[PDB]
Amino acid sequence: ILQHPDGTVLKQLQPPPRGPRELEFYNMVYAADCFDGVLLELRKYLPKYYGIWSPPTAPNDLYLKLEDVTHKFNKPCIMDVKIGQKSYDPFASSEKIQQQVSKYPLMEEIGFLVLGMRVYHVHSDSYETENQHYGRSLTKETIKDGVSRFFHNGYCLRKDAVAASIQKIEKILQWFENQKQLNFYASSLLFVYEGSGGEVEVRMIDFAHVFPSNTIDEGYVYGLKHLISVLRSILDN
Numbered sequence: 001i002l003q004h005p006d007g008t009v010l011k012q013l014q015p016p017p018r019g020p021r022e023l024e025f026y027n028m029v030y031a032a033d034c035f036d037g038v039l040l041e042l043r044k045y046l047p048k049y050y051g052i053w054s055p056p057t058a059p060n061d062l063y064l065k066l067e068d069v070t071h072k073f074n075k076p077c078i079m080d081v082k083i084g085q086k087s088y089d090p091f092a093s094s095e096k097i098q099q100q101v102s103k104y105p106l107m108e109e110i111g112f113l114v115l116g117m118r119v120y121h122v123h124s125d126s127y128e129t130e131n132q133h134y135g136r137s138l139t140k141e142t143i144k145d146g147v148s149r150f151f152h153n154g155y156c157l158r159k160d161a162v163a164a165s166i167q168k169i170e171k172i173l174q175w176f177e178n179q180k181q182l183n184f185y186a187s188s189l190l191f192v193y194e195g196s197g198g199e200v201e202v203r204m205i206d207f208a209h210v211f212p213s214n215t216i217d218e219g220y221v222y223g224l225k226h227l228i229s230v231l232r233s234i235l236d237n
Protein backbone atom coordinates (compact mmCIF):
# COMPACT_ATOMS: atom_id res chain seq x y z
CA ILE A 1 0.00 0.00 0.00
CA LEU A 2 1.40 3.39 -0.98
CA GLN A 3 0.03 6.62 0.50
CA HIS A 4 -0.27 9.56 -1.92
CA PRO A 5 -0.70 13.21 -0.72
CA ASP A 6 -3.67 13.68 -3.15
CA GLY A 7 -5.85 11.85 -0.56
CA THR A 8 -5.56 8.42 -2.15
CA VAL A 9 -3.81 5.12 -1.62
CA LEU A 10 -2.34 2.91 -4.29
CA LYS A 11 -2.81 -0.79 -3.54
CA GLN A 12 -0.61 -3.18 -5.50
CA LEU A 13 -2.51 -6.01 -7.17
CA GLN A 14 -1.71 -9.28 -5.48
CA PRO A 15 -0.58 -12.20 -7.65
CA PRO A 16 -3.31 -13.91 -9.66
CA PRO A 17 -6.06 -14.90 -9.13
CA ARG A 18 -6.35 -12.54 -6.14
CA GLY A 19 -5.27 -9.19 -7.62
CA PRO A 20 -7.32 -9.63 -10.81
CA ARG A 21 -10.36 -10.63 -8.76
CA GLU A 22 -10.16 -7.52 -6.59
CA LEU A 23 -9.73 -5.29 -9.64
CA GLU A 24 -12.79 -6.87 -11.19
CA PHE A 25 -14.74 -6.47 -7.95
CA TYR A 26 -14.10 -2.74 -7.97
CA ASN A 27 -14.77 -2.51 -11.74
CA MET A 28 -18.14 -4.22 -11.23
CA VAL A 29 -19.29 -2.12 -8.31
CA TYR A 30 -18.12 1.19 -9.76
CA ALA A 31 -19.20 0.48 -13.37
CA ALA A 32 -20.36 3.76 -14.85
CA ASP A 33 -23.37 2.05 -16.43
CA CYS A 34 -24.38 0.24 -13.21
CA PHE A 35 -28.04 0.62 -12.18
CA ASP A 36 -28.19 -2.37 -9.78
CA GLY A 37 -29.54 -0.82 -6.57
CA VAL A 38 -27.59 -3.27 -4.40
CA LEU A 39 -24.27 -2.28 -5.97
CA LEU A 40 -25.10 1.46 -5.96
CA GLU A 41 -25.78 1.29 -2.20
CA LEU A 42 -22.60 -0.80 -1.63
CA ARG A 43 -20.53 2.10 -2.97
CA LYS A 44 -21.36 4.02 0.20
CA TYR A 45 -19.43 1.56 2.31
CA LEU A 46 -16.31 1.11 0.11
CA PRO A 47 -13.45 3.45 -0.51
CA LYS A 48 -14.11 5.56 -3.60
CA TYR A 49 -12.45 3.93 -6.55
CA TYR A 50 -10.37 5.85 -9.08
CA GLY A 51 -9.63 2.95 -11.36
CA ILE A 52 -6.60 0.91 -12.16
CA TRP A 53 -3.34 2.82 -12.09
CA SER A 54 0.23 2.18 -13.33
CA PRO A 55 3.35 4.35 -13.48
CA PRO A 56 3.60 6.18 -16.86
CA THR A 57 6.88 4.32 -17.48
CA ALA A 58 5.73 0.86 -16.18
CA PRO A 59 2.39 -0.49 -17.58
CA ASN A 60 3.35 -3.92 -16.10
CA ASP A 61 3.06 -2.62 -12.54
CA LEU A 62 -0.64 -2.69 -11.50
CA TYR A 63 -2.34 -0.84 -8.64
CA LEU A 64 -5.84 0.07 -7.51
CA LYS A 65 -6.21 3.80 -6.83
CA LEU A 66 -8.54 4.22 -3.86
CA GLU A 67 -9.77 6.90 -1.44
CA ASP A 68 -7.53 7.06 1.60
CA VAL A 69 -10.20 6.60 4.26
CA THR A 70 -7.91 8.28 6.88
CA HIS A 71 -7.19 11.47 4.96
CA LYS A 72 -9.69 13.76 6.65
CA PHE A 73 -8.46 12.96 10.19
CA ASN A 74 -5.79 14.84 12.17
CA LYS A 75 -4.75 11.93 14.39
CA PRO A 76 -6.47 8.92 12.79
CA CYS A 77 -6.87 5.85 15.00
CA ILE A 78 -7.15 2.86 12.65
CA MET A 79 -8.15 -0.78 13.12
CA ASP A 80 -8.52 -3.45 10.51
CA VAL A 81 -10.89 -6.31 11.37
CA LYS A 82 -11.33 -9.35 9.14
CA ILE A 83 -14.99 -10.41 9.04
CA GLY A 84 -16.64 -13.84 8.65
CA GLN A 85 -16.58 -17.46 9.87
CA LYS A 86 -14.26 -18.64 7.13
CA SER A 87 -11.21 -16.80 5.83
CA TYR A 88 -10.78 -19.25 2.96
CA ASP A 89 -12.83 -19.04 -0.20
CA PRO A 90 -14.95 -21.68 -1.98
CA PHE A 91 -12.09 -22.77 -4.28
CA ALA A 92 -9.40 -23.17 -1.64
CA SER A 93 -7.30 -26.36 -1.52
CA SER A 94 -7.10 -28.47 1.69
CA GLU A 95 -3.69 -26.89 2.30
CA LYS A 96 -5.05 -23.35 2.03
CA ILE A 97 -8.04 -24.23 4.21
CA GLN A 98 -5.66 -25.61 6.82
CA GLN A 99 -3.40 -22.58 6.56
CA GLN A 100 -6.25 -20.16 7.12
CA VAL A 101 -7.96 -22.08 9.90
CA SER A 102 -4.58 -22.54 11.67
CA LYS A 103 -4.00 -18.73 11.56
CA TYR A 104 -7.02 -18.42 13.85
CA PRO A 105 -8.96 -21.60 14.67
CA LEU A 106 -11.50 -19.49 16.56
CA MET A 107 -12.81 -17.78 13.37
CA GLU A 108 -15.91 -19.97 13.19
CA GLU A 109 -16.69 -19.30 16.85
CA ILE A 110 -16.01 -15.53 16.94
CA GLY A 111 -16.69 -14.48 13.32
CA PHE A 112 -14.02 -11.79 13.21
CA LEU A 113 -10.32 -11.28 13.72
CA VAL A 114 -8.48 -8.05 14.52
CA LEU A 115 -5.63 -7.78 12.02
CA GLY A 116 -4.01 -4.73 13.58
CA MET A 117 -4.53 -1.30 15.08
CA ARG A 118 -2.82 2.03 15.52
CA VAL A 119 -4.08 4.10 18.45
CA TYR A 120 -3.30 7.68 19.38
CA HIS A 121 -2.35 8.27 23.01
CA VAL A 122 -3.18 11.82 23.99
CA HIS A 123 -0.87 12.14 27.02
CA SER A 124 2.23 11.27 25.00
CA ASP A 125 1.13 12.65 21.63
CA SER A 126 2.17 9.32 20.15
CA TYR A 127 0.86 6.12 18.62
CA GLU A 128 0.81 2.57 19.89
CA THR A 129 0.31 -0.23 17.39
CA GLU A 130 -0.67 -3.86 17.57
CA ASN A 131 0.13 -6.34 14.84
CA GLN A 132 -1.39 -9.57 13.49
CA HIS A 133 -0.30 -11.65 16.50
CA TYR A 134 -2.31 -9.45 18.86
CA GLY A 135 -5.75 -10.29 17.45
CA ARG A 136 -4.81 -13.90 16.71
CA SER A 137 -4.04 -14.27 20.42
CA LEU A 138 -7.56 -13.19 21.40
CA THR A 139 -9.92 -15.74 22.79
CA LYS A 140 -13.56 -15.62 23.68
CA GLU A 141 -12.48 -14.66 27.21
CA THR A 142 -10.32 -11.73 26.02
CA ILE A 143 -12.05 -10.51 22.82
CA LYS A 144 -13.91 -7.63 24.51
CA ASP A 145 -10.84 -6.14 26.21
CA GLY A 146 -8.90 -6.83 23.01
CA VAL A 147 -11.30 -4.72 20.97
CA SER A 148 -11.77 -2.06 23.70
CA ARG A 149 -8.03 -1.32 23.57
CA PHE A 150 -8.58 0.35 20.15
CA PHE A 151 -10.84 2.91 21.74
CA HIS A 152 -8.74 3.79 24.80
CA ASN A 153 -6.51 6.83 24.37
CA GLY A 154 -4.39 6.48 27.47
CA TYR A 155 -6.81 8.19 29.80
CA CYS A 156 -10.41 7.48 28.85
CA LEU A 157 -12.37 4.98 26.81
CA ARG A 158 -13.84 6.70 23.71
CA LYS A 159 -17.44 5.50 24.02
CA ASP A 160 -18.45 8.07 21.39
CA ALA A 161 -16.33 6.30 18.82
CA VAL A 162 -17.59 2.86 20.00
CA ALA A 163 -21.22 4.00 19.65
CA ALA A 164 -20.60 5.60 16.22
CA SER A 165 -18.89 2.36 15.11
CA ILE A 166 -21.95 0.32 16.04
CA GLN A 167 -24.18 2.73 14.18
CA LYS A 168 -22.08 2.54 11.05
CA ILE A 169 -21.69 -1.25 11.16
CA GLU A 170 -25.49 -1.45 11.50
CA LYS A 171 -25.91 0.15 8.03
CA ILE A 172 -23.45 -2.32 6.57
CA LEU A 173 -25.34 -5.15 8.25
CA GLN A 174 -28.53 -3.85 6.66
CA TRP A 175 -26.90 -3.92 3.26
CA PHE A 176 -25.91 -7.54 3.88
CA GLU A 177 -29.44 -8.45 5.01
CA ASN A 178 -30.82 -7.13 1.71
CA GLN A 179 -28.46 -8.79 -0.79
CA LYS A 180 -27.91 -12.38 -2.00
CA GLN A 181 -25.55 -11.85 -4.84
CA LEU A 182 -22.09 -11.62 -3.24
CA ASN A 183 -20.28 -13.50 -0.51
CA PHE A 184 -17.17 -11.95 1.03
CA TYR A 185 -14.27 -14.04 2.37
CA ALA A 186 -11.10 -12.65 3.92
CA SER A 187 -12.56 -9.13 3.68
CA SER A 188 -12.29 -6.47 6.38
CA LEU A 189 -13.85 -3.51 8.04
CA LEU A 190 -11.50 -0.54 8.42
CA PHE A 191 -12.32 1.54 11.49
CA VAL A 192 -11.11 5.07 11.82
CA TYR A 193 -11.78 7.64 14.50
CA GLU A 194 -10.30 10.97 15.41
CA GLY A 195 -7.71 10.66 18.16
CA SER A 196 -6.99 14.38 18.71
CA GLY A 197 -14.66 14.59 18.64
CA GLY A 198 -17.03 13.00 16.33
CA GLU A 199 -15.79 11.97 12.85
CA VAL A 200 -15.72 8.19 12.43
CA GLU A 201 -15.33 5.92 9.38
CA VAL A 202 -16.16 2.24 9.01
CA ARG A 203 -15.47 1.04 5.49
CA MET A 204 -15.30 -2.34 3.78
CA ILE A 205 -11.91 -3.12 2.23
CA ASP A 206 -9.81 -5.99 0.82
CA PHE A 207 -11.79 -7.80 -1.92
CA ALA A 208 -9.49 -10.49 -3.34
CA HIS A 209 -11.98 -13.23 -2.27
CA VAL A 210 -15.45 -11.87 -3.09
CA PHE A 211 -17.53 -14.30 -5.11
CA PRO A 212 -20.93 -14.28 -6.72
CA SER A 213 -23.50 -16.21 -4.68
CA ASN A 214 -27.20 -17.18 -4.45
CA THR A 215 -27.29 -17.10 -0.64
CA ILE A 216 -27.04 -14.61 2.15
CA ASP A 217 -23.47 -14.32 3.41
CA GLU A 218 -24.24 -15.95 6.77
CA GLY A 219 -20.60 -15.97 7.87
CA TYR A 220 -20.35 -12.24 7.26
CA VAL A 221 -23.65 -11.57 9.04
CA TYR A 222 -22.62 -13.70 12.07
CA GLY A 223 -19.33 -11.77 12.27
CA LEU A 224 -20.96 -8.32 12.09
CA LYS A 225 -23.64 -9.25 14.65
CA HIS A 226 -21.02 -10.57 17.04
CA LEU A 227 -18.81 -7.54 16.53
CA ILE A 228 -21.76 -5.28 17.32
CA SER A 229 -22.54 -7.36 20.45
CA VAL A 230 -18.97 -6.95 21.66
CA LEU A 231 -18.95 -3.21 20.92
CA ARG A 232 -22.31 -2.86 22.69
CA SER A 233 -20.99 -4.48 25.89
CA ILE A 234 -18.01 -2.06 25.77
CA LEU A 235 -20.55 0.81 26.11
CA ASP A 236 -21.30 -0.57 29.61
CA ASN A 237 -17.66 -0.28 30.85
Ligand SMILES: Nc1ncnc2c1ncn2[C@@H]1O[C@H](COP(=O)(O)OP(=O)(O)O)[C@@H](O)[C@H]1O
Pocket residue numbers: 001009011047066067068069070078080115188190205206207
Ligand atom coordinates in the same frame (compact mmCIF):
# COMPACT_ATOMS: atom_id res chain seq x y z
N1 LIG B 1 -8.69 2.68 1.14
C1 LIG B 1 -7.86 2.77 2.23
N2 LIG B 1 -7.73 3.87 3.01
C2 LIG B 1 -6.90 3.89 4.08
N3 LIG B 1 -6.15 2.85 4.46
C3 LIG B 1 -6.20 1.69 3.75
C4 LIG B 1 -7.09 1.59 2.59
N4 LIG B 1 -6.98 0.36 2.06
C5 LIG B 1 -6.09 -0.29 2.83
N5 LIG B 1 -5.61 0.49 3.83
C6 LIG B 1 -4.63 0.06 4.85
O1 LIG B 1 -3.75 -0.90 4.26
C7 LIG B 1 -3.87 -2.17 4.92
C8 LIG B 1 -3.76 -3.33 3.92
O2 LIG B 1 -4.77 -3.22 2.92
P1 LIG B 1 -5.57 -4.49 2.41
O3 LIG B 1 -6.44 -4.04 1.28
O4 LIG B 1 -6.20 -5.14 3.62
O5 LIG B 1 -4.35 -5.35 1.83
P2 LIG B 1 -3.93 -6.91 2.07
O6 LIG B 1 -4.52 -7.61 0.88
O7 LIG B 1 -2.43 -6.76 1.99
O8 LIG B 1 -4.49 -7.42 3.37
C9 LIG B 1 -5.18 -2.12 5.66
O9 LIG B 1 -5.19 -2.91 6.86
C10 LIG B 1 -5.35 -0.66 5.97
O10 LIG B 1 -4.72 -0.34 7.20
Ligand SMILES: O=P(O)(O)O[C@@H]1[C@H](O)[C@H](O)[C@@H](OP(=O)(O)O)[C@H](OP(=O)(O)O)[C@H]1O
Pocket residue numbers: 018087103132186208
Ligand atom coordinates in the same frame (compact mmCIF):
# COMPACT_ATOMS: atom_id res chain seq x y z
O1 LIG C 1 -0.66 -12.30 7.86
P1 LIG C 1 0.12 -13.57 7.70
O2 LIG C 1 0.30 -14.32 8.98
O3 LIG C 1 1.35 -13.47 6.81
O4 LIG C 1 -0.90 -14.51 6.89
C1 LIG C 1 -1.52 -14.06 5.69
C2 LIG C 1 -2.95 -13.57 5.93
O5 LIG C 1 -3.75 -14.62 6.50
C3 LIG C 1 -3.55 -13.11 4.60
O6 LIG C 1 -4.87 -12.56 4.78
C4 LIG C 1 -3.57 -14.28 3.61
O7 LIG C 1 -4.03 -13.85 2.35
P2 LIG C 1 -5.53 -14.15 1.87
O8 LIG C 1 -6.37 -13.46 2.90
O9 LIG C 1 -5.54 -13.52 0.47
O10 LIG C 1 -5.68 -15.64 1.85
C5 LIG C 1 -2.18 -14.85 3.39
O11 LIG C 1 -2.29 -16.01 2.58
P3 LIG C 1 -1.19 -16.34 1.44
O12 LIG C 1 0.03 -16.75 2.21
O13 LIG C 1 -1.79 -17.48 0.65
O14 LIG C 1 -1.00 -15.08 0.64
C6 LIG C 1 -1.54 -15.22 4.71
O15 LIG C 1 -0.20 -15.60 4.48
Ligand SMILES: [Mg+2]
Pocket residue numbers: 188206
Ligand atom coordinates in the same frame (compact mmCIF):
# COMPACT_ATOMS: atom_id res chain seq x y z
MG1 LIG D 1 -6.18 -7.02 4.33
Ligand SMILES: [Mg+2]
Pocket residue numbers: 186206207208
Ligand atom coordinates in the same frame (compact mmCIF):
# COMPACT_ATOMS: atom_id res chain seq x y z
MG1 LIG E 1 -6.05 -9.45 1.52
